[PDB]
Subunit: 151 residues, 4 copies
């Protein structure tokens, strides 16, 4: 099976149950591992982005799902972890392309920007869409790794 | 207020659009074009890296990056310490990336988002100031600490 | 002041309070007139679209706000009423342009597609943005009226 | 399965794109182009009306309409009895317009939505069938009753 770590900030916690469900809906082979806040209390998105991102980078899980108001902060923070390719997605097309082109391992969504049924579609599309494997994409992904190494 | 612009090959089609949209944001905004000179095939991480390093070094205040979806641009740019690159798809995301995240690079998808919405995104990104709020400052500092820890 | 009638279907009823608030946020001159379901009970979107659309067409109110899952059914149903120009909006740009170009009098939104903070921005933008008045737009709007008259 | 296509002048730029995207949906899908023959200025309601009447008459099964935002297209087309025109901005809206509303016309914004998302919208619209569900049938009939009452 394929483990999928999930994290949110405080307001996106409203939909953490949704996110668990949508991971499961992508197929029986996907196992949600919830790592978000246990409560509605105030938190800082970078702490939860880091947590999920580290799990992905250390390969404890295959994929990450991160949600906050816009998804923007989650995508910035998560990408700061070497080995992470986190994609802010807003529709089916970006969800699919992040996998096909970028072999993205983390999907980020905005709970105050994107309606829940579109978030559902984003998560399912992201999990089900395979990486293309094509020459140019592999080269570009390796160049991103090169950038990490240079810092 | 200098603004470095980069694209890949497909998005090169709108590089003159992006230069124009930066100027439309105000007389003080100065575009510095760093993308491909031709329509020939290039790799997005190279141009992401060029723009991102300029922002990180403090050579320009802002960056603008375009490719098909904007996704690879935002991933590659964020690998540079000091960069906070925001993939925006509308006015709301453009504004909030500045207000919440003090984003210094805006990424757009030329194949996903129409040019008139791209225009709105770039103008909003440049014109909208960072809120300076306590919580945002703290969280931005936490991102910097994630960079440092790696 | 400027009266703004509001209608939803059953699931979008979850945010009817939001919609009332956002109308008020556009300015003190905008008065929300709630005409949606009073309860979470099952309803048919055309009945509520019609209700708000008729109010706009008879000029009892200046503007309408309609919400359902996607906003699509509301825009179809509302446009069936002569005198109504109902715009399905998904962002700030479409909200502004519907006013500038089409002098739209009803804004439709999808509660399951568009996040609430973007719905907020759509409603404020739609109410605050004036119709341009330009020659070509007036001609085109009159042509839409011509289409109504021919049926 | 015939599909009538109309645009205004700016969206005329992608009229060959739309023809191609209709064909990509399947061999059975036949585009019938009814938009402007040149880039010269026209009024969107005229082309909306042409396509919409064809759908209403049962001359074609589906219509595709493009302009800057798609908004005027969806308003004008819906003025024709029997038309259910859906302004779509993504895969989800394209699919749901068919599943819930049995939409017969798809409207897109050439200045708001990128061409690759437009491609996805048109293919999804044509390939996705109406659910036939009881509630949807009833609500669609209620729309027809609103037409009749006017």
């Amino acid at each position: 099976t394929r483990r999928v770590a999930i994290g949110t900030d405080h307001p996106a916690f409203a939909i953490h149950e949704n996110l668990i469900l949508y991971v499961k809906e992508a197929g029986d082979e996907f196992v949600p591992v919830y790592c978000g806040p246990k409560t509605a209390e105030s938190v800082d998105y970078p702490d939860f982005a880091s947590r999920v991102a580290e799990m992905v980078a250390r390969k404890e899980v295959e994929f990450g799902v991160l949600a906050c108001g816009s998804g923007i902060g989650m995508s910035i923070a998560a990408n700061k972890v070497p080995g992470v390719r986190a994609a802010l997605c807003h529709d089916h097309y970006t969800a699919a392309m992040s996998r096909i082109h970028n072999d993205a391992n983390i999907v980020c969504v905005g709970e105050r920007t994107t309606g829940v049924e579109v978030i559902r579609e984003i998560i399912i599309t992201f999990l089900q869409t395979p990486f293309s494997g094509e020459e140019r994409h592999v080269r570009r992904i390796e160049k991103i790794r090169a950038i990490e190494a240079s810092h």
